[PDB]
Design an enzyme around this catalytic site. Structure first.
Site, PDB file in Angstrom:
ATOM      1  N   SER A 282      -8.925  44.775  -1.257  1.00 59.20           N
ATOM      2  CA  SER A 282      -9.581  45.255  -1.939  1.00 59.20           C
ATOM      3  C   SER A 282     -10.796  46.585  -0.730  1.00 59.20           C
ATOM      4  CB  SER A 282      -9.793  44.863  -2.953  1.00 59.20           C
ATOM      5  OG  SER A 282     -10.748  46.267  -3.477  1.00 59.20           O
TER       6      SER A 282
ATOM      7  N   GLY B 181      -8.449  48.948 -14.468  1.00 59.71           N
ATOM      8  CA  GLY B 181      -7.779  47.089 -13.664  1.00 59.71           C
ATOM      9  C   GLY B 181      -8.321  46.903 -12.595  1.00 59.71           C
TER      10      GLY B 181
ATOM     11  N   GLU C  49     -10.860  46.094 -17.191  1.00 60.06           N
ATOM     12  CA  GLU C  49      -9.898  44.462 -15.990  1.00 60.06           C
ATOM     13  C   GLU C  49     -10.126  43.706 -17.653  1.00 60.06           C
ATOM     14  OE1 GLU C  49      -8.941  43.006 -14.257  1.00 60.06           O
ATOM     15  OE2 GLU C  49      -8.539  43.760 -12.737  1.00 60.06           O
ATOM     16  N   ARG C  50      -9.626  42.295 -17.316  1.00 59.01           N
ATOM     17  CA  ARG C  50      -9.390  41.772 -17.780  1.00 59.01           C
ATOM     18  C   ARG C  50     -10.879  40.565 -18.251  1.00 59.01           C
ATOM     19  NH1 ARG C  50      -4.629  37.896 -16.503  1.00 59.01           N
ATOM     20  NH2 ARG C  50      -5.199  37.597 -14.525  1.00 59.01           N
TER      21      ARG C  50
ATOM     22  N   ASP D 285      -7.918  46.378 -21.748  1.00 59.20           N
ATOM     23  CA  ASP D 285      -6.431  45.588 -21.969  1.00 59.20           C
ATOM     24  C   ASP D 285      -6.248  47.573 -21.386  1.00 59.20           C
ATOM     25  OD1 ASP D 285      -3.902  45.356 -21.876  1.00 59.20           O
ATOM     26  OD2 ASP D 285      -3.662  44.910 -23.910  1.00 59.20           O
ATOM     27  N   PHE D 286      -4.918  47.244 -19.892  1.00 58.73           N
ATOM     28  CA  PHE D 286      -4.582  49.384 -20.188  1.00 58.73           C
ATOM     29  C   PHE D 286      -2.830  49.195 -20.769  1.00 58.73           C
ATOM     30  CE2 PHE D 286      -4.285  46.845 -15.594  1.00 58.73           C
ATOM     31  CZ  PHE D 286      -2.323  46.526 -15.500  1.00 58.73           C
TER      32      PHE D 286
ATOM     33  N   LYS E 201      -5.207  51.358  -8.508  1.00 55.57           N
ATOM     34  CA  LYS E 201      -4.883  50.568  -7.405  1.00 55.57           C
ATOM     35  C   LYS E 201      -3.870  49.400  -7.139  1.00 55.57           C
ATOM     36  CE  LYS E 201      -8.389  49.012  -4.317  1.00 55.57           C
ATOM     37  NZ  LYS E 201      -7.647  48.225  -3.793  1.00 55.57           N
TER      38      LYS E 201
ATOM     39  N   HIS F 273       2.822  48.272  -8.738  1.00 58.81           N
ATOM     40  CA  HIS F 273       3.233  48.126  -8.271  1.00 58.81           C
ATOM     41  C   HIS F 273       3.991  46.241  -8.980  1.00 58.81           C
ATOM     42  CE1 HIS F 273       0.995  45.584  -5.106  1.00 58.81           C
ATOM     43  NE2 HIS F 273       0.997  45.124  -5.838  1.00 58.81           N
TER      44      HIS F 273
ATOM     45  N   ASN G 206       1.027  51.081  -1.911  1.00 54.26           N
ATOM     46  CA  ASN G 206       1.709  50.881  -0.984  1.00 54.26           C
ATOM     47  C   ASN G 206       3.366  51.352  -2.073  1.00 54.26           C
ATOM     48  OD1 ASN G 206       0.990  47.242  -1.382  1.00 54.26           O
ATOM     49  ND2 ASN G 206       0.637  49.219   0.266  1.00 54.26           N
TER      50      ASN G 206
HETATM   51  N1  LIG Z   1      -3.542  44.619 -18.617  1.00 54.87           N
HETATM   52  C1  LIG Z   1      -4.463  44.419 -18.056  1.00 54.87           C
HETATM   53  N2  LIG Z   1      -5.512  45.317 -18.644  1.00 54.87           N
HETATM   54  C2  LIG Z   1      -6.052  45.337 -17.517  1.00 54.87           C
HETATM   55  N3  LIG Z   1      -6.062  44.504 -16.192  1.00 54.87           N
HETATM   56  C3  LIG Z   1      -4.951  44.221 -16.227  1.00 54.87           C
HETATM   57  C4  LIG Z   1      -3.969  43.470 -16.938  1.00 54.87           C
HETATM   58  N4  LIG Z   1      -3.457  43.507 -16.651  1.00 54.87           N
HETATM   59  C5  LIG Z   1      -3.339  42.785 -15.237  1.00 54.87           C
HETATM   60  N5  LIG Z   1      -4.512  43.590 -15.579  1.00 54.87           N
HETATM   61  C6  LIG Z   1      -5.012  43.822 -13.790  1.00 54.87           C
HETATM   62  O1  LIG Z   1      -4.882  44.181 -12.851  1.00 54.87           O
HETATM   63  C7  LIG Z   1      -5.328  44.323 -11.492  1.00 54.87           C
HETATM   64  C8  LIG Z   1      -4.235  43.856 -10.481  1.00 54.87           C
HETATM   65  S1  LIG Z   1      -4.760  43.355  -9.085  1.00 54.87           S
HETATM   66  C9  LIG Z   1      -5.418  44.751  -8.408  1.00 54.87           C
HETATM   67  C10 LIG Z   1      -7.730  45.091  -7.900  1.00 54.87           C
HETATM   68  C11 LIG Z   1      -8.036  46.404  -8.280  1.00 54.87           C
HETATM   69  N6  LIG Z   1      -7.228  47.183  -8.269  1.00 54.87           N
HETATM   70  C12 LIG Z   1      -7.766  46.455  -6.367  1.00 54.87           C
HETATM   71  O2  LIG Z   1      -7.030  46.923  -6.131  1.00 54.87           O
HETATM   72  O3  LIG Z   1      -8.177  45.133  -5.403  1.00 54.87           O
HETATM   73  C13 LIG Z   1      -6.146  42.019 -11.569  1.00 54.87           C
HETATM   74  O4  LIG Z   1      -7.046  42.062 -11.244  1.00 54.87           O
HETATM   75  C14 LIG Z   1      -5.390  41.844 -13.294  1.00 54.87           C
HETATM   76  O5  LIG Z   1      -6.990  41.646 -13.506  1.00 54.87           O
HETATM   77  C1  LIG Z   2      -1.757  43.575  -7.722  1.00 57.65           C
HETATM   78  O1  LIG Z   2      -0.080  42.679  -7.471  1.00 57.65           O
HETATM   79  C2  LIG Z   2      -0.512  41.630  -5.815  1.00 57.65           C
HETATM   80  C3  LIG Z   2      -0.379  40.705  -6.112  1.00 57.65           C
HETATM   81  C4  LIG Z   2      -0.257  39.845  -7.978  1.00 57.65           C
HETATM   82  C5  LIG Z   2      -0.194  39.431  -4.880  1.00 57.65           C
HETATM   83  O2  LIG Z   2       0.283  38.256  -5.103  1.00 57.65           O
HETATM   84  C6  LIG Z   2      -0.545  40.296  -2.847  1.00 57.65           C
HETATM   85  C7  LIG Z   2      -0.257  42.046  -3.935  1.00 57.65           C
HETATM   86  C8  LIG Z   2      -0.675  42.502  -5.375  1.00 57.65           C
HETATM   87  O3  LIG Z   2      -1.534  44.123  -4.431  1.00 57.65           O
HETATM   88  C9  LIG Z   2      -1.230  41.800  -2.470  1.00 57.65           C
HETATM   89  C10 LIG Z   2      -1.828  42.832  -2.223  1.00 57.65           C
HETATM   90  O4  LIG Z   2      -2.378  43.211  -1.397  1.00 57.65           O
HETATM   91  C11 LIG Z   2      -1.053  45.036  -0.605  1.00 57.65           C
HETATM   92  N1  LIG Z   2      -0.396  45.399  -1.518  1.00 57.65           N
HETATM   93  O5  LIG Z   2      -1.484  45.175   0.457  1.00 57.65           O
HETATM   94  C12 LIG Z   2      -0.693  40.844  -1.725  1.00 57.65           C
HETATM   95  O6  LIG Z   2       0.030  40.782  -0.312  1.00 57.65           O
HETATM   96  C13 LIG Z   2      -0.471  41.420   0.398  1.00 57.65           C
HETATM   97  C14 LIG Z   2      -2.299  40.632  -0.989  1.00 57.65           C
HETATM   98  N2  LIG Z   2      -3.708  39.874  -1.423  1.00 57.65           N
HETATM   99  C15 LIG Z   2      -2.274  39.050  -1.702  1.00 57.65           C
HETATM  100  C16 LIG Z   2      -1.945  38.769  -2.466  1.00 57.65           C
HETATM  101  N3  LIG Z   2      -0.825  39.954  -2.460  1.00 57.65           N
END
Ligand SMILES: Nc1ncnc2c1ncn2[C@@H]1O[C@H](CSCC[C@H](N)C(=O)O)[C@@H](O)[C@H]1O
Ligand SMILES: COC1=C(C)C(=O)C2=C(C1=O)[C@@H](COC(N)=O)[C@@]1(OC)[C@H]3N[C@H]3CN21
Ligand SMILES: Nc1ncnc2c1ncn2[C@@H]1O[C@H](CSCC[C@H](N)C(=O)O)[C@@H](O)[C@H]1O
Ligand SMILES: COC1=C(C)C(=O)C2=C(C1=O)[C@@H](COC(N)=O)[C@@]1(OC)[C@H]3N[C@H]3CN21
Lengths: 339, 339
Positions: A157, A180, A203-204, A230-231, A245, A249, A278
């Site tokens: 991120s 989220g 976020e959670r 909660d989304f 973001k 997926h 992605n």
């Molecule tokens: N029901 C829900 N309500 C709010 N957030 C949620 C959710 N289910 C999953 N998530 C959140 O979705 C995130 C996916 S990871 C992505 C985190 C951030 N958008 C980034 O790009 O770095 C997690 O941090 C998780 O806490």
């Molecule tokens: C939120 O969903 C995702 C889950 C649950 C993962 O375990 C996970 C990703 C996700 O997006 C990728 C993030 O990275 C990208 N998408 O570029 C990742 O794999 C490269 C990189 N954090 C490591 C783990 N792994």
């Protein structure tokens, strides 16, 4: 060319052992070996003592790793040293590989892959049957698992936040909601670059608190609301721009659609959704397909192509406006409008 | 060196993804995909139909696999084809990779690797803490696991048996005993190459019956006695030559000395003992060290150097006469006599 098969076999054997090559790195970062090597070479004896590892067995591990290029086996006095590849493993909130290595070291992560066959048979996440609980459930109850994932997601991120803030003009927006948004580094990068923006992070609860901590320490605590939410249920109405973001997926088609319709109904006619994720194109990198498989194993998710995602939007009352790149990877920013 | 650090991160990320590549292969051989492609290309649809897989998920696995060189994606009509790498995976009791791939597919194999950290802290098997039972006990009680393992060892032995019969002169021996001789291919090769020789095969009871089936089927029942037993309690005395192949590397120093002392007391001053095993020299190959790590994880074993074997033989009242090349790998024939 009788021994053409001999190479075939060697190649496939090296692939199989690749599993073991990966578990060895997992063990090396779990013990924290690479940070012990920052102040110069150290003996496997000192390394074992400092990590709580069996001396001879750790020596076997390091000899092996060095042979495949991770760490340097100095070849005398039991000394091993940092090298290009092992330095990548230094723990750092900002290192994708290092945080992911540590996240993969976790037993429940490996156990999910144990049941890959279950995923292939059912289309469902194997994490559930291997570990006796969903991945989201586990990251909710287990502060350590939650931290490993958040750090691993957090590092990716961080390097993505600054690039999204530069690929999209947020001036003209009074409010942005991040759906989220994990630890809020995307929100934090955007606020900084657009002083007039107001932000909201969803976020959670436990992660929300993490984001509050990160934003606060960024001097943006007054510019961004934190909503422990909660989304599948809650999203703020009337925002100018919504962001999401590496969330979608994580979900199957029906679930992606449930989320999209929730966002649609909260959007103004002039609002914009930025789906950041992605995309699978016509020439997907191997690296990209592996992540697609990880997503199936951990959460039953999937990476989607241009049209797969377009099909879903048209199920959710939304339309693709623009689609622009975000860092010579598979990551794209998809600008979306209400239909 | 921005670009240098990017390339290092990628190299390491590949290593990590390598575990997933291996498991993808395990799933493919577990489902039976290579067998279904011997008579030309099939669609992911049909492959799914035949194997009981979830169609869309099987398609993703195949596409991922084909991107890494296993199977061909034909690119049209949802078709996939056998290729050189996937042919190697065709079920053949004489194929090390094919049988080993199937061995590794077992969840209990993968789970032992789940707990590599335990092994590295203790020098002991992780198999026991991962699976609730020891490797030798599992292969003792559970016929499926016995069969997976015996096949993987069996295929390696077929190759080796021939290389050994032609590497050593048995023309001066009347009686040979193979200690823990597995399914019996080594004895078989030696008896075949030496019509005057007679033999005895000692193995755990269920394994002994498998040796009886192999040896009888190949017309050698009349010249080889099958002795169900335990090499910690029993070594038949008075034979001309003893063989112990890939057994000692399974056992820690204490246990190897137990085995060796008992073999020592069974030998006539004229007897020879052949220790056949992987010898660690200066600068071993990665492949040799990986198998060393497998031994660690599965049974708490370890590969040893000659000097290390020498010390153990020393505590056992034996000594090394000479060591000969064999099969052109790390395997070596170490001829020993009573001291
Ligand atoms: N029901 C829900 N309500 C709010 N957030 C949620 C959710 N289910 C999953 N998530 C959140 O979705 C995130 C996916 S990871 C992505 C985190 C951030 N958008 C980034 O790009 O770095 C997690 O941090 C998780 O806490
Ligand atoms: C939120 O969903 C995702 C889950 C649950 C993962 O375990 C996970 C990703 C996700 O997006 C990728 C993030 O990275 C990208 N998408 O570029 C990742 O794999 C490269 C990189 N954090 C490591 C783990 N792994
Ligand atoms: N306590 C014991 N007594 C006798 N045999 C044993 C034993 N513990 C393990 N073994 C046997 O040791 C063998 C090691 S596998 C090697 C098999 C054979 N020598 C070959 O090279 O192909 C297994 O077949 C196992 O059944
Ligand atoms: C007897 O101890 C061994 C155990 C318990 C194994 O699982 C195992 C081997 C052993 O020696 C190797 C044999 O073959 C060699 N030593 O080359 C092997 O991996 C290389 C190949 N049979 C596959 C499995 N695996």
């Amino acid at each position: 060319g009788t021994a053409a098969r001999a190479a075939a076999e060697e190649t496939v054997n090296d692939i199989l052992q690749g599993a073991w090559k990966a578990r060895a790195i997992h063990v090396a970062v779990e013990l924290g070996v690479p940070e012990l090597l920052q102040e110069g070479p150290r003996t496997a004896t000192a390394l074992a003592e400092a990590t709580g590892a069996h001396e001879q067995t750790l020596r076997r591990l390091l000899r092996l790793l060095a042979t495949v290029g991770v760490f340097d086996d100095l070849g005398h006095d039991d000394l091993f040293a940092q090298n290009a590849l092992s330095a990548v493993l230094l723990p750092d909130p900002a290192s994708p590989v290092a945080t992911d290595a540590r996240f993969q070291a976790a037993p429940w992560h490996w156990r999910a892959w144990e049941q890959l066959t279950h995923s292939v048979r059912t289309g469902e996440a194997s994490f559930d049957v291997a570990n006796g609980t969903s991945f989201w459930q586990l990251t909710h109850e287990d502060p350590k698992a939650r931290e490993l994932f958040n750090r691993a997601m957090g590092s990716v991120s961080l390097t993505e936040a600054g690039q999204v803030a530069a690929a999209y003009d947020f001036s003209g927006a009074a409010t942005a909601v991040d759906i989220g948004g994990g630890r809020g580094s995307l929100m934090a990068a955007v606020l900084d670059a657009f002083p007039g923006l107001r932000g909201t992070l969803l976020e959670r609860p436990p992660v929300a608190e993490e984001a509050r901590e990160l934003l606060t320490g960024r001097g943006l605590a007054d510019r961004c609301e934190i909503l422990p939410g909660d989304f599948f249920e809650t999203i703020p109405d009337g925002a100018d721009v919504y962001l999401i973001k590496h969330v979608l997926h994580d979900w199957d088609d029906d679930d992606v659609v449930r989320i999209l319709r929730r966002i649609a109904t909260a959007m103004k006619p002039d609002s914009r959704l930025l789906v950041i994720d992605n995309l699978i194109d016509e020439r997907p990198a191997a690296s990209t397909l592996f992540v697609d498989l990880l997503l199936l194993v951990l959460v039953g998710g999937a990476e989607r192509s241009e049209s797969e995602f377009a099909a879903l939007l048209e199920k959710s009352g939304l339309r693709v406006e623009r689609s622009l790149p975000c860092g010579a990877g598979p990551v794209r920013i998809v600008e979306i409008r209400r239909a």
